[PDB]
């Protein structure tokens, strides 16, 4: 219902994508015919579009879809990662498994900030609908609504979640508009927290790493990340 497997017959090794904070896993798809040889398993929020029974912690749902890839792949070794929103939640997932003994060899975050080292802005659903609209989504529209309603709700379960150390292996794929800032620092992240992270760069905006222009130099970069 909100697993959705690509490329189910491949013999080339598994992936699992948590959606970003839009909430939605549609993303991905376009890396299907990038990495025809990876089954990709990729998860949407079941409470998208959805106004109660709302997460309480982003653990909570962290744990929900450990449980969900536990019956997609039940055997490690295990590749996690997420876009933006959707990596903070593979951290999670792999910090729980990693503790109940499951082997996580790659924890894949791509462009993902922590937002909970982040300073309060200005309102936040104001926040959400001006973004949107420069984005060119309309705000107001059925579509809209539920998008609004799901950031808001994800960005405050990352912002309430302060992330633990994680001793595997990451990979933290980063847009080229840090400079001289150090880009693990820029992200709310430090090697305390990942002592084993290799940096990789991929062109293009944080918002458009999955458009069709794009998908192509992500897969890239994602293909050098696992290998
Ligand atoms: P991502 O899934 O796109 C992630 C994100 C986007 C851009 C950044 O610079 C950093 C992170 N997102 C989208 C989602 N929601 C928000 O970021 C909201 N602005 C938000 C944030 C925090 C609260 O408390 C409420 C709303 C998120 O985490
Ligand atoms: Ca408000
Ligand atoms: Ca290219």
Known sequence: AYVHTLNPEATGGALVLVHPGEGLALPYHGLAPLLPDVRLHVLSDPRFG???????????????????????????????????????????MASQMTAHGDEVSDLLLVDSHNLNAAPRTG?????????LVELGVDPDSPEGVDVVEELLHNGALAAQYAPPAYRGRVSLLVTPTD?????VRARGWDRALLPDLVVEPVPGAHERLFDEEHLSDTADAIRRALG
Not at 179 to 183: E, Q, V, W
């Open 50 to 92: 959805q106004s109660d029974n709302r997460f309480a912690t982003l653990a909570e749902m962290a744990t929900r879809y450990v449980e969900w890839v536990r019956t997609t792949e039940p055997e490690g070794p295990y590749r996690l990662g997420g876009w933006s929103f959707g990596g903070v939640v593979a951290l999670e």
């Open 123 to 131: 309102d936040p659903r104001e926040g959400v609908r001006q973004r």
């Open 179 to 183: 400079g001289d800032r150090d880009a």
